[PDB]
Design a protein around this nucleic acid. Structure first.
Ligand SMILES: Nc1ncnc2c1ncn2[C@@H]1O[C@H](COP(=O)(O)NP(=O)(O)OP(=O)(O)O)[C@@H](O)[C@H]1O
Ligand SMILES: [Cl-]
Ligand SMILES: [Cl-]
Ligand SMILES: [Cl-]
Ligand SMILES: [Mg+2]
Ligand SMILES: [Mg+2]
Ligand code: NA
Length: 326
DNA sequence: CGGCGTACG
DNA sequence: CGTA
DNA sequence: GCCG
């Protein structure tokens, strides 16, 4: 088992679901406390279990697995022995965890804002609605739409949204294309949002595109919330039988020269990309982002025509999106 | 011990 | 600060 | 919290 998540296939569904879920509770709680290092180790240990070919049934099967030391092994041991880990259950029922989860789930609220509100004594969404002076426009929208945004986006919803975006994109710039990215491209059947990547086959024609797209979607009455730009984090009005629901949609524009890097970056998973960028820098001495891959010795950028090119550049076996579910 | 992804709005 |  |  290699040490980086980008070195091994990780399927969406696997054989250690309960164990990985428990470790990811501890990772999430670490993040709520600002402990980024412990968050990473618990995320990585969870991801290792996702990549295994069969269930862990005995503690000895953790020997030699990367990112399993005393703490993560004890968590697994307790789950195997008793079906529950006391530390995990204590986190789950704690007021701190439940409120930080509730607050950081709001669009426009991160850990730092959630934590300040927690320390001020705030605990519920209605607590926030009662003091709207303390809210940004973005947070106001996130709170108004919170119930709809808490409902999973279905793969069956994605196709309708993509046609709508393609219509506006085609008027904004004929020939521009729309590619589904994010979790749905990795095979997920549900999501928290829909992520789209937009480009044009003629380098440079994509300049200034996203304002033109957003103006057209807004004119069609489809935009419940949005903020020159190349990323847009929106709330869309999605038709439903006899009504509609609010859905988060992310739009990103990239020039075609950067499209493989942007596709790779925006297809995720989040942990897969962090691990990939960590691997690139630490093992290969190359700097990776959603725009390119930089050699800081030669001061040159790698040209890539595909995701396959990028994996080859980095000396990694290619993983299709369905195996990037780290 | 230092390191832990990397951008844009 | 938020967001991907 | 774990790796190197
Ligand atoms: N913090 C991050 N660091 C690096 N890449 C990230 C980060 N957040 C998001 N991304 C990239 O943006 C993609 C879309 O982000 P999302 O926040 O939309 N997560 P996604 O994988 O789509 O699952 P859902 O919760 O939406 O169902 C991710 O899959 C990553 O490729
Ligand atoms: Cl470029
Ligand atoms: Cl590609
Ligand atoms: Cl980036
Ligand atoms: Mg998504
Ligand atoms: Mg998104
Ligand atoms: Na949030």
């Amino acid at each position: 088992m290699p040490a980086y998540a980008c070195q091994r296939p990780t399927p969406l569904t696997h054989h250690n679901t309960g164990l990985s879920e428990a470790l990811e509770i501890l990772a999430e709680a670490a993040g709520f406390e600002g402990s980024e290092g412990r968050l990473l180790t618990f995320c990585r240990a969870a991801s290792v279990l996702k990549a295994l070919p069969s269930p862990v049934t005995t503690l000895s099967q953790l020997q030699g697995l990367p990112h399993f030391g005393e703490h993560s092994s004890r968590v697994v041991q307790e789950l195997l022995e008793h079906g529950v880990c006391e530390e995990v259950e204590r986190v789950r029922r704690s007021e701190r965890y439940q409120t930080m989860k509730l607050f950081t789930q709001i669009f426009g609220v991160g850990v730092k804002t959630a934590d300040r509100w927690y320390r001020e004594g705030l605990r519920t969404l209605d607590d926030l609605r009662e003091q709207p002076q303390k809210l940004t426009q973005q947070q106001k929208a996130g709170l108004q739409h919170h119930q709809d945004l808490s409902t999973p986006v279905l793969r069956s919803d994605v196709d309708a949204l993509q046609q709508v975006v393609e219509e506006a994109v085609g008027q904004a710039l004929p020939g521009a294309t729309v590619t589904l990215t994010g979790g749905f491209r990795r095979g997920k059947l549900q999501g928290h949002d829909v992520d789209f990547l937009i480009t044009h086959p003629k380098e440079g024609q994509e300049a200034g595109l996203l304002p033109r797209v957003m103006c057209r979607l807004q004119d069609q009455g489809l935009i419940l919330y949005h903020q020159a730009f190349e990323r847009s984090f929106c709330i869309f009005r999605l038709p439903q039988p006899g009504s509609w629901k609010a859905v988060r949609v992310d739009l990103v524009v990239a020039p075609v020269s950067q499209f493989p890097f942007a596709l790779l970056g925006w297809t995720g998973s989040k942990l897969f990309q962090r691990e990939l960028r960590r691997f690139s820098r630490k093992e290969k001495g190359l700097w990776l982002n959603s725009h390119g891959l930089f050699d800081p010795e030669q001061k040159t950028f790698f040209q890539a025509a595909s995701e396959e090119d990028i994996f080859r550049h980095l000396g990694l076996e290619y993983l299709p999106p369905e195996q990037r579910n780290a």
